[PDB]
Paper text:
ATP-dependent Lon proteases are key participants in the quality control system that supports the homeostasis of the cellular proteome. All Lons are single-chain, multidomain proteins containing an ATPase and protease domains, with different additional elements present in each subfamily. Primary structures of more than 100 Lon proteases from various organisms became available by the year 2000. Their comparative analysis showed that Lon proteases are non-classical serine peptidases, with catalytic centers formed by serine–lysine dyads. We thus postulate that this enzyme is the founding member of a newly identified LonBA subfamily, so far found only in the gene sequences of firmicutes.
The crystal structure of the P domain of BsLonBA (residues 347–552) was determined at the resolution of 1.9 Å. This arrangement results in the creation of an expected planar hexamer. The insertion of 14 residues (392–405) in the P domain of BsLonBA creates a 12-stranded β-barrel in the core of the hexameric assembly formed by β-hairpin inserts of the neighboring subunits (a detailed description below). Six inserts arranged around the three-fold symmetry axis complete a 12-stranded antiparallel β-barrel, where each insert forms nine hydrogen bonds with the neighboring subunit. We have captured the P domain in an inhibited state, in the complex with bortezomib, a covalently bound inhibitor. Bortezomib is covalently bound to the Oγ of Ser445 via the boronate moiety. Within the active site, bortezomib creates β-sheet-like interactions with residues of β1 (A359, V360, Y361) on one side, and residues of the loop β6-α3 (I441, D442) on the other side. Oxygen atoms of the boronate moiety make additional hydrogen bonds with the side-chain amine of Lys488 and the main chain nitrogen of Ser445.
Residue numbers in the entry:
A (entry chain B): 348 to 535
B (entry chain A): 352 to 547
The structure:
């Protein structure tokens, strides 16, 4: 209907050739106390195991949020000033590092009250130095964005391939940096 | 945000170079250590008896902080975030000297030679302890375009002398790692110079 504050279109893949678009929602309020970060709708922990051994870690999605908050501090924001809540609606259990640029964009937008273009979808792992790192399932993700009525899709520079140029009816933007993501999507 | 070139082995003979990211900022509150990209806990055994422990990676981070403390740094003055990039859980004690160098470099600003990769467990006294997969690690350092690789002294063996096209530096201490990888910082608009 409109560009909007703290709503960003992310992308997911389930197995080789099955992509989808998720409408990630970000709320930022002046902190009650020390500031906080909460996420609804993500894996909190992953376990990988064999017969006799297994490891457990905080999820790549939760790790991704911590990278995002470190990047926003290097850019001169103070996330400790805010209680921040990110919501992946629907109740679907999602994981992975590839929503890093989308959550970062969502928080930036919510903090600055600058709406994000609703015609854009994006996928991109974020590094602590603001670089956009390659992701999985970029073709099914682009087709999901198109299939959903997105005019544009932001992908990491290193996911660029010749075959992408053969896709019609959606603008594919390759980015190296989170600043380039903000340039592409923020409205005024 | 500084980069240190760490090394990993996956199966008997495959190595990779990891660009480990280290962010160190003035503490927002009581200071903090956060690591992304690692195993945090390991369970070993069966139904009948199993143990659970902090991962080797997490233990390695605790040893790093103790060493920096014994060297007169106060890691609790900082919020420290180390990111091991991508989407594989990494584990092991062998990134001890990489994480310690990355934090050192970030605290003092004295930046890290980007042509150097390294592997080594760190002890509390700051000795560099032997690691596994030293040969595939060296080969992966070479393939990534590293000109130098730091290894533990006790990993030195005759056959490494057969490896061409990379300088292999054996170290006994963390101070030696820092002697070898730290570059003279820039000199412009400084009241004095720091030389290594
Ligand atoms: C937080 C989410 C949206 C990030 C994206 N996740 C996914 O695409 C993941 C697949 C993935 C890819 C790489 C690493 C781990 C898991 N997909 C899902 O979680 C998923 C998709 N559809 C239904 C239910 N779950 B990304 O890493 O590709
Ligand atoms: C923190 C990491 C980088 C330290 C290094 N780890 C690895 O090489 C470990 C194997 C290992 C070796 C010794 C003890 C435990 C596990 N490798 C990995 O975790 C690994 C390697 N390639 C891709 C993804 N993960 B080291 O202990 O050799
Ligand atoms: Na994504
Ligand atoms: Na290593």
């Amino acid at each position: 209907v409109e560009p909007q504050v703290g709503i960003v279109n992310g992308l997911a893949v389930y197995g080789p050739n099955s992509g989808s678009l998720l409408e990630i929602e970000v709320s930022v309020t002046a902190a009650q106390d020390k500031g906080s970060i909460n996420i609804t709708g993500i894996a909190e922990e992953e376990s990988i195991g064999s017969q006799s051994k297994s490891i457990r870690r905080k999820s790549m999605a939760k790790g991704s949020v911590e990278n995002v908050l470190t990047v926003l501090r290097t850019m001169g924001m103070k996330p400790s000033d805010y209680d921040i809540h990110i919501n992946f609606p629907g109740g679907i259990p999602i994981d992975g590092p590839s929503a890093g640029i989308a959550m970062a964009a969502g928080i930036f937008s919510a903090i600055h009250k600058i709406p994000i273009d609703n015609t854009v979808a994006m996928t991109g792992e974020i590094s602590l130095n603001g670089l956009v790192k390659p992701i999985g399932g970029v073709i099914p993700k682009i087709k999901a964005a198109k299939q959903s009525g997105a005019k544009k899709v932001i992908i990491p520079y290193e996911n660029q391939q010749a075959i992408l140029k053969q896709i019609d009816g959606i603008e594919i933007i390759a980015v190296k940096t989170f600043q380039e993501v903000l340039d592409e999507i923020l409205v005024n």
